[PDB]
Amino acid sequence: AFRYTRSQSFDIFDINQKCFVLESPTQLVALHLQGPSSSQKVRLNIALYRPRGPQMPVALGIKGYKLYMSCVMSGTEPTLQLEEADVMRDIDSVELTRFIFYRLDSPTEGTTRFESAAFPGWFICTSLQPRQPVGITNQPDQVNIATFKLSG
């Protein structure tokens, strides 16, 4: 279990300077943005949680679109999705742990990885190629990018 402490908004880019856009209500994509005002860069409203004991556990809100990121099984594959969810005070079930990621900062380099709490060993990643969905991988930074830079 995790209990909400506060939220803070951040810009995010991957290590190749791709940002996120909301391609459709259920899919984020990563691209090099310099487009029109129908392609609006996504910011994250990062909800920080305090654990029980069983670390910076966070939920990742898609700022202004009323969505949170989650990891769920689809078929037999771990999958990143976006779900309509309100702000969750208490994450106190295996089910709700789908919304929790461990924010893993490398302070010296200012980079960050996000590991799923529901699927340990799985990390948020982007394709090496632009205009592809944001996903999860158990081979972080291996023919994908799992390294991000956040700025508040």
Separation CA 49–CA 51 (nearest Å):
6
Contact between residue 124 and residue 101 where contact means Cβ atoms under 8 Å apart: yes
Residue of 133, 137, 92 whose CA lies nearest to 119: 137
Q: How was this structure determined?
A: X-ray
Contact between residue 115 and residue 61 where contact means Cβ atoms under 8 Å apart: no
Residue 3: burial class (beta carbons within 10 Å; 0-12, 13-18, 19+)? middle
Residue of 133, 88, 76, 140 whose CA lies nearest to 114: 140
E runs forming strands in 26-134: 27-31, 44-50, 57-62, 67-74, 77-84, 90-91, 101-106, 111-116, 123-125, 132-133
Considering the segment(s) 1-152 as one domain, its CATH architecture is Trefoil (2.80)
Separation CA 29–CA 140 (nearest Å):
17
Q: How crowded is residue 70: how many other Cβ atoms within 10 Å of its Cβ?
A: 21
* Nominal resolution (angstroms): 1.7
Length of the chain: 152
